Amino acid sequence: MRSLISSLDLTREEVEEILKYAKEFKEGKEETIKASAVLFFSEPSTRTRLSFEKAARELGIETYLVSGSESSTVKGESFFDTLKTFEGLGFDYVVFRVPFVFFPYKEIVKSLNLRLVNAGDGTHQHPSQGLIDFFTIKEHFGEVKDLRVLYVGDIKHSRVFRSGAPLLNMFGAKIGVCGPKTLIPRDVEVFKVDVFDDVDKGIDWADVVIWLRLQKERQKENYIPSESSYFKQFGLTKERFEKVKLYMHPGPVNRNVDIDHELVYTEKSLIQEQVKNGIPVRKAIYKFLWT
Amino acid sequence: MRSLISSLDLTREEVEEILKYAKEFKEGKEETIKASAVLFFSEPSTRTRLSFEKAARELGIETYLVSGSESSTVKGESFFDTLKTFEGLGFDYVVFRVPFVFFPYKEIVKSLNLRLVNAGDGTHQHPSQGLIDFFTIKEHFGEVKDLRVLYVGDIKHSRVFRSGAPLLNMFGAKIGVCGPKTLIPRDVEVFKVDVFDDVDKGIDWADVVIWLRLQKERQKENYIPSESSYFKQFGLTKERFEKVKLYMHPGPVNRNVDIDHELVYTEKSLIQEQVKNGIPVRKAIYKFLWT
Amino acid sequence: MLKLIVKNGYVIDPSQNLEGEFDILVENGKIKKIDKNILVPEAEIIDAKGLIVCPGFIDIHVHLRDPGQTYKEDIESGSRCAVAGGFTTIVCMPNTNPPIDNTTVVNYILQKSKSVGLCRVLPTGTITKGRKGKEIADFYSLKEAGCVAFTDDGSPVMDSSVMRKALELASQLGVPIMDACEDDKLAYGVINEGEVSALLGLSSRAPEAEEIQIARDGILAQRTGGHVHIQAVSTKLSLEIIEFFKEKGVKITCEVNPNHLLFTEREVLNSGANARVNPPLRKKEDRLALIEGVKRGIIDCFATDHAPHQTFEKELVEFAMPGIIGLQTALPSALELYRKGIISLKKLIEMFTINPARIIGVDLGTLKLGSPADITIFDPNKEWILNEETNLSKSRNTPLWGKVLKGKVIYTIKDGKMVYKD
Amino acid sequence: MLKLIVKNGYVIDPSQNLEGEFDILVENGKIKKIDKNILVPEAEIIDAKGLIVCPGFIDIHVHLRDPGQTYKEDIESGSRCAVAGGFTTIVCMPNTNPPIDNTTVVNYILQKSKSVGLCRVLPTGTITKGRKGKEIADFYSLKEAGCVAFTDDGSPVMDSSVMRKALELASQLGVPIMDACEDDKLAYGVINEGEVSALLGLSSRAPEAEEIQIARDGILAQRTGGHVHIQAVSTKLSLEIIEFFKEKGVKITCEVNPNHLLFTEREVLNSGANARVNPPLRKKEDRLALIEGVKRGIIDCFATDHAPHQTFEKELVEFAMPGIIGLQTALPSALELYRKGIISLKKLIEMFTINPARIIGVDLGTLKLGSPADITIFDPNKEWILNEETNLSKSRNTPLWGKVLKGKVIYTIKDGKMVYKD
Ligand SMILES: O=C(O)C[C@H](NC(=O)CP(=O)(O)O)C(=O)O
Ligand SMILES: O=C(O)C[C@H](NC(=O)CP(=O)(O)O)C(=O)O
Ligand SMILES: O=C1C[C@@H](C(=O)O)NC(=O)N1
Ligand SMILES: O=C1C[C@@H](C(=O)O)NC(=O)N1
Ligand SMILES: [Ba+2]
Ligand SMILES: [Ba+2]
Ligand SMILES: [Ba+2]
Ligand SMILES: [Zn+2]
Ligand SMILES: [Zn+2]
């Protein structure tokens, strides 16, 4: 009966198990889980919320949606008390996305009779996205071992990076980061990463590049002089398209900031593939947590 | 084919009937009602909305959710016209929570081919919560007759008090109130209540104490000098915990305002029990209103 | 100090309907026995022969200026004034700087007063935070720390719900509101709206400013059940309004500043800014009505509103700080009414002792067996002059400066200890 | 209490280069003689056989939370912690509520501390009014009332002229500035900018925030002639900068929180919000540099920055109040360095006694003849656990909660009076 709060808590075996279910679901496996899930979102979401929702429903899980600013959070109900409320209401799963870092989480998880699934907690973790990104990379290449995976952009504020990098590392991939030096953590090498000052070197090095969106709503000061200059320095431009081998973006894309307006859906883009992998990976997670 | 707008409209027999269904549902009774319900919330809610929703779904009722500020209320549709819209759309039930007092209501109820269920109307009524509180008290003690039930806090702004007190009274319980004198109605004795100036006397008197949240979003001026002083004067502090026999809170709790941070889930607290009783009581209400 | 005897004095204890020539035995700071010619082995003796012996006086309206304005007065200088005037208990007002709207300021005052060790100083809290008139203060914490009442003195409360809420929360706690009654739209000038303002063109303060708030407070007291104490009453209509609410059983009490018994607005022409005070000195008809309100029991007690200000704050009337010192002059001032046969000596003592005690709900102002040995001993006939030789205040601001007073404290006793002697 | 003798202990008084097995005679709260086998008629005796006897410890960085946050700790609970930890003198920080920026708050603390009567509590004042960082506070009135230093702890001063003006006006008065060094543009997150912030995405506080202000303060101290004391030093570069100014003869002193000697940022992963502190726990290299700065005499004293917060203020790191309690754990924590042979026992005592005394200019931290009999007696080897049985703080916020400590106070003596015993 467990929870998935952080990629850092998954063993190799657990990832193999999840991704095996995900592949099975992608190939059309049906399965019924008689459960209910409440999806508690106090940050915006399109794909993460809808894929968790649709994944649940296709498994027979009844889904309930609560957005933070309509919930009794507005009356001062703490995060813990909200989850405890979900527990009293008989929910089996709680899929949550919140604007703060949920750390420490272990004692709270342990104290609840609930299957908690982190759909994003501030700048901290988004484990299902890391799983989707790993699965997407693996589906493309066969294995991730020794692959060179470059993340570009706002690393500092990225729960997508923090969920994906450890999983890739754990299976022998090599991670690189490139972005405005103001948005690269000083001790980013805690993820065993190479740092590229220059995105063109990073792109030549990379087997796959994951562009990340500027987390403007999370940034406590201005970190970059401008979006169009950022695009020239770091973005997937038309010139860079010739050289890029393959690329990803967890979404949503900011066109002409991250990726050129014309380059979102090319034969080199796995972006739509990440979307399509959302439901099977998120089904795999409900299943993996069903005891 | 009726509605439940106010506790004041329930006879003894009706309450016995509702609570009998609630007990049956709590003990696992299944039942199907082929109906649809629209849940129309223009104030925040977690537990009331989710328990009405989950209650409906477990009875086979299709549920639809509308939050006020996404609805055509924003285009000037009046409350009545919204309900009439629900009627044209074929809803059987309308569960509503609104920021104003729905009074008078009888003529409007009578004019609609709908089962209206008040999930909270301003400072006026919240009948399902009064039923849940009565049921919770009754499940604990066996009967409510001659029990001493103390409500603490913002009485003036409390639809929870106004729904619970008449039901308890009707079955012979004794109601007491204690709170900032600025938040006790001058003619609170219209509920046949004793008034305690001092929460420690109230706590010694009470068999069960229901802490109420300060209705800050309803208060038209400042009534108390501060939240931490309120907590010292009226809150369930650690010192008071030794003396309190049993306690409740309709939720959400404001920790260290109503109830000490450590005292929300103790062996003396029925708070979680109120949450767990939500669905069976709200099922009982749908059933009670199904003709 | 195990044992003290106050011998041969004329004892008056109105709380007990007790008077005559009796001795008082004090044991461990407390009243032990009251009887004819008491004698005990190894006792301290003070001889009160030819003098009046009564409970220590209680002044429920004093400005100690401490913290924040200690060049005017401080807890020490005010306490010396108090005891030199016969007061063993004073209530200090909360218009200090910082104001008494938190428990730190209360505790500072309590601790400093204990260190000084002359009279009991009982703090009040503000009605509003910062005394700004907008938000009720934390009554619960302030009462628990030792405040005995709430007032925004010397500022009125202008919002009626604020005042209502003050009364509600205070009565819930069992303590009164003391209200400084002067509507600030009608009282923003410097002296009474009467003959002197008309003659000189000084800005004025309308008597209705006081009356309207007293009427408001009586109504609020009536409807909330709270107790409101009206500070420094100054007009005939005011007393009429108070009596109208007292007649209905409303918990409304009041006090008079003895200066308002002695002086009218005309004093502004003789004493300049030392007659500037809020509420102002008003007309003859008001002065006489006040005396009549004392006689008829409408005014519940004397209270000085001892309000010291320095000489440079008492120059041009327009710029002068309002207030008059009075702790050392209260008794001879009151005794003027006794001499004219307006009140009895018992009545004068009631107004200084048991009446103020009952207003603030303290068990003092009494010589009941077992109660604290707070005793004042005075000569109703002894003449003296308030001047540099005799003034214990840091300030001098009173029209009685340099004038002959009749009536004077010989001994002040607090918990069985002599804290003052002539 | 005329006469007390501390017998058979191993006395260490670094201020006098005095050590050996000596007895101490105390007369009227003061040190009278120190000699082999002293014996006097009708003396109190405490036997210190097998124990270390030294001057009472002085902690120049303590949060008493009093006034205004007394649910965290108050003067009483903090004083019990102090004495249980071997401290006879503590300096309290001014980030109370209301803050210590006026003489009422100073006096409240002084008087309350006298009532409590366990250790000497020396207040500091704020650098700025309200600690808002804009206007210098009234140093003159605050020093006169008893403040021994000014700090805006736990807020940095961001304007350089404000800091310069603080240093100028303080040095004119002969008192130091204690500066909470963390530039608020570079330190507005919750933990160190290192591995843990990178791994978890918690907002961070850059080591340069501390370094830049320490460098600024050394320069200001140099040019004004004022004395600046750097609180809770936490990085290698910081110590390098301090030493650079000490080398030039600048009056700059510093302290280390023993927690920074014991823990790194990694502790955030093991203890969660009980490792949230400003300045943060930083890296291994910093921890080791700190220990090296203690060894080489760059760090002048230990000071706890005892900073209690309740458990509900120590839940999710992002929302947690920063701070660690430390008064009861300072000594065993320090003794860890003694056990590893990093510092001598004399050196450890210097850092708790004479060094902090000299920083704040008080004649304490000594067993000199005629000086106050503030004496601490301790067992360097006695094991205990900080838990519910043993904690005297109202709060529990320390990563050492529940862990085995070695080194413990057996007796604390203040003015010849035993105020604590094991
Ligand atoms: O928002 C991003 O930049 C990446 C990532 N995005 C998503 O999960 C997609 P969505 O917000 O549409 O669910 C996230 O961290 O929320
Ligand atoms: O809000 C309260 O204080 C009591 C009561 N609360 C509830 O019904 C719980 P919720 O708002 O989470 O549905 C209400 O009146 O809405
Ligand atoms: O209301 C007040 C306050 C007082 C003072 O100086 O405090 N002086 C006055 O004359 N009237
Ligand atoms: O600068 C500070 C202040 C302190 C507090 O809680 O007062 N706690 C800290 O951790 N750092
Ligand atoms: Ba695992
Ligand atoms: Ba009916
Ligand atoms: Ba919305
Ligand atoms: Zn006054
Ligand atoms: Zn500090």
Residue numbers in the entry:
A (entry chain B), B (entry chain B): 1 to 291
C (entry chain A), D (entry chain A): 1 to 422
Original authors' sentences:
Dihydroorotase (DHO) catalyzes the reversible interconversion of carbamoyl aspartate and dihydroorotate, the third step in de novo pyrimidine biosynthesis. The isolated DHO monomer, which lacks catalytic activity, has an intact α-site and conserved β-site ligands, but the geometry of the second metal binding site is completely disrupted. However, the putative β-site is restored when the complex with ATC is formed and DHO activity is regained.
The most convincing evidence demonstrating that a second zinc ion is not required for catalysis was the replacement of two β-site first shell ligands, His180 and His232, with alanine, which eliminated the β-site but had no significant effect on the steady state kinetic parameters. The double mutant was crystallized under similar conditions as the wild type enzyme except that citrate, which binds weakly to the DHO and ATC active sites, was omitted. Both the DHO substrate, dihydroorotate, and the ATC bisubstrate analogue, PALA, were included in the “cryo” solution in an attempt to increase the order and thus the X-ray diffraction of the crystals. The asymmetric unit in space group H23 includes one DHO subunit with one zinc atom and dihydroorotate in its active site, one ATC subunit with PALA in its active site, three barium atoms bound to the ATC subunit, and twelve ethylene glycol molecules (PDB ID: edo). In this structure, the biological unit in the crystal is the same as the native structure, a tightly bound dodecamer with 23 symmetry formed by six asymmetric units. The crystal structure of the double mutant showed strong anomalous difference density for zinc at the alpha site (above 17 sigma) and none at the beta site at the 3σ contour level. The crystal structure of the active double mutant showed a zinc atom in the α-site and a water molecule Jβ (HOH2080/A) near the β-site - thus eliminating the unlikely possibility that the one zinc atom was randomly distributed between the two sites. Although the mutant A. aeolicus DHO has alanine replacing the two histidines and dihydroorotate replacing citrate, it is still very similar to the native structure as evidenced by a rmsd value of 0.29 Å for the 422 Cα atoms. The mutant DHO-ATC structure is the first with the bisubstrate analog, N-phosphoacetyl L-aspartate (PALA) bound to the active site of the A. aeolicus ATC subunit.
